Design a protein around this ligand. Structure first.
Ligand SMILES: [Zn+2]
Ligand SMILES: [Zn+2]
Lengths: 138, 99, 198, 46, 66, 101
């Protein structure tokens, strides 16, 4: 519902004044969906990327804050809210360049604002690679 | 006397009252007056009301008669010069071809 | 003051002899400064519907609650739990399932499924403290009894918990008690010359 | 306790604890979806 | 996706008129008679039902189920 | 054409209803067809069509508001099927599109 008039002087050059009550009721309400994907591969040597479980705090029987939203498989769980510098997939990879020794390579949510996880997709390719895709919502 | 137009309050050219204030009373006086105009004129205009509508561009009957006469007169003068080029004499203006 | 019409949810009345600077104050208070009870927090357990949780929480906010706002205080800053004095609570819980019997054509949802539409009548009031004695049954309800919130398919589930608190409409527009409040000056169309004939 | 993943095509619980290639138990579908979290999340109704 | 609970412009509860509006259109009312029968006097409420698209009725086919 | 014997062919594919020909059910959908429209899927049920064209054979028209409840199927089926043979008048269903030859 547009009134074509000059109101408040905050509309001098193409700027348009909106109504607060209309925005509260749902005018212009939008959703932004973003991706995050991780690939776990099987190398030429018989070694593999892996997802470690959440690293618990031994003193409090709860995961550390950077791991707060990880499920027991080390992949983030649908419904929970991610915040900046929090891990989504607790990936570790071999530094082969006698037993394996692993360096942590976590997929982490960089983003100035908080996002919610809607679904986590797990599928595999013929080469025994494991593919994980996260759908994120704001 | 006189209303304030673009030529007196705007950016186009001199004879601007803010330019007079700048050159005669200093930089701070010009900047204050601009801030006062930016504050005062929205308070008037938003409580006067100012709007454009389809009735502000609709041609009245005094134009629709005039426009019909102009088109008929202008097209018939063109049609005669068309005939004067293809099938007669056209007064060829100096320095240009007949077309 | 002349009251010219009044029924359920509507009122028209005339004020004579007051100025615009005071009648407009009454218009603005009714929009923005008269308080009501509305949902601010939703605690979601197992939402599996297609409706996004942030969208569902926005919808549940806008449902008007029949609670009389004079009997409740403002919840203090912080204070995530709240108490008997200053919050109500509602519980929405709907599971959608297939109908065990259906005709072979099976075309329409209203036969195939049960609870495939969530309506505001599924909101159950959950009393805190002595509220169950202060309010007779049915006083604390959603007003309309027919507002669609979500819409389901079998296997999908909604379970949540709402916290209604008190607030004014200047804060958020789900607190305003009026559909619209406005006024108009009264016309007096007068005939300067007698108009007869056709 | 074992992780349960939900099949994309037929919505059937598969419980893929073992390091087997991803594959549905009842049907041939090879895409799996994680289930929703048990923990509560609070949303402002705004 | 789904009918908004309140009209954006004034806040009348139009979110409960939708299942009625589709019903009256089966009884072959016109749109302008159907909205008048529900009480939508102002045109800002009328466009809520008149311009709505019922997307959730069609997204819910693709949606997973037992 | 052999315009007398051929009716034993035409009887298998069209039957005369209200002064005009009407297509038979088996030409449009055999019994495993999926829904032809969007919205909620539905299964084929040819007698859910044949009953409608039967009502046009006995009555003047289909004349009442909520036949979709009696035959149970979607309004999105009935009002779409009807739309290939008729045009709407207010409240009284549909109008037969061509005159009574
Ligand atoms: Zn499967
Ligand atoms: Zn409205």
């Amino acid at each position: 519902t547009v009134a074509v008039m000059s109101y408040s002087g905050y509309d001098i050059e193409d700027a348009l004044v909106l109504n607060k009550a209309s925005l509260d009721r749902g005018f212009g309400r939008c959703l932004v969906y973003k991706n995050a994907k991780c690939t776990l591969k099987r190398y030429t040597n018989q070694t593999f990327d892996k997802v470690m479980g959440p690293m618990l705090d031994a003193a409090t029987r709860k995961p550390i804050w950077r791991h707060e939203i990880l499920d027991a498989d080390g992949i983030c769980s649908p419904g929970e809210k991610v915040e900046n510098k929090q891990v989504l997939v607790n990936k570790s990879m071999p530094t082969v360049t006698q037993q394996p020794q692993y360096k942590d390579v976590p997929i982490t949510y960089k983003g100035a604002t908080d996002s919610y996880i809607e679904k986590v997709m797990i599928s595999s390719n013929a080469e025994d690679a494991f593919l994980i895709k996260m759908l994120l919502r704001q | 006397s006189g209303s304030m137009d673009k030529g007196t309050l705007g950016s186009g050219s001199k004879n601007n009252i803010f330019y007079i204030l700048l050159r005669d009373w200093g930089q701070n006086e010009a900047a204050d007056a601009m801030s006062r105009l930016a504050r005062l004129a929205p308070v008037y205009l938003s409580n006067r009301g100012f709007s454009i509508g389809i009735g502000d561009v609709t041609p009245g009957q005094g134009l629709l008669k005039a426009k019909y006469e102009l088109l008929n007169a202008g097209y018939k003068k063109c049609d005669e010069y068309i005939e004067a080029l293809n099938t007669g004499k056209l007064q060829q203006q100096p320095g240009c071809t007949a077309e | 003051v002349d009251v010219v019409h009044m029924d359920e949810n509507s009122l028209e009345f005339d004020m004579v002899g007051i100025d615009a600077a005071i009648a407009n104050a009454f218009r603005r208070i009714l929009l923005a400064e008269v308080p009501t009870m509305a949902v601010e927090k939703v605690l979601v357990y197992n939402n599996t519907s297609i409706v996004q949780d942030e969208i569902l929480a926005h919808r549940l906010g806008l449902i008007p609650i029949h609670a009389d706002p004079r009997l409740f205080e403002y919840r203090n800053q912080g204070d995530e739990e709240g108490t008997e004095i200053d919050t109500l609570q509602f519980r929405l819980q709907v599971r959608c399932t297939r109908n065990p019997h259906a005709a072979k054509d099976s075309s329409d949802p209203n036969e195939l499924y049960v609870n495939h539409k969530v309506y505001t009548r599924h909101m159950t009031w959950i009393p805190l403290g002595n509220q169950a004695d202060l309010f007779p049954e049915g006083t604390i309800r959603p007003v309309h009894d027919d507002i669609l919130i979500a819409q389901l398919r079998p296997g999908q589930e909604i379970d949540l918990l709402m916290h209604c608190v008190k607030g004014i409409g200047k804060d958020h527009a789900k607190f305003s008690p009026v559909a619209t409040a406005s006024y108009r000056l009264l016309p007096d169309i007068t005939l300067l010359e007698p108009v007869e004939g056709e | 306790q074992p992780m349960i993943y939900i099949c994309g095509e037929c919505h059937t619980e598969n419980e893929i604890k073992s390091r087997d290639p991803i594959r549905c138990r009842e049907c041939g579908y090879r895409i799996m979806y994680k289930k929703r979290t048990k923990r509560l999340v609070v949303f402002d109704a705004r | 996706m789904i009918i908004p609970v309140r009209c954006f412009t004034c806040g009348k509860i139009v979110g409960n008129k939708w299942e009625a509006y589709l019903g009256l259109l089966q009884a072959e009312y016109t749109e302008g008679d159907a909205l008048d029968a529900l009480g939508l006097k102002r045109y800002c409420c009328r466009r809520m039902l008149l311009a709505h698209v019922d997307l959730i009725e069609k997204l819910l086919n693709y949606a997973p189920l037992e | 054409i052999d315009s007398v014997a051929v009716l034993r062919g035409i009887q298998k594919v069209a039957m005369l209803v209200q002064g005009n020909w009407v297509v038979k059910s088996d030409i449009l959908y055999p019994k495993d067809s999926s829904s032809p429209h969007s919205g909620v899927p539905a299964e084929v049920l040819c007698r859910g069509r044949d009953f409608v064209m039967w009502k046009f054979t006995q009555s003047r028209w289909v004349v009442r508001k909520e036949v979709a409840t009696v035959t149970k199927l979607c309004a999105e089926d009935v009002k779409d099927f009807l739309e290939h043979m008729a045009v709407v008048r207010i409240n009284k269903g549909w109008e037969f599109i061509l005159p009574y030859d």
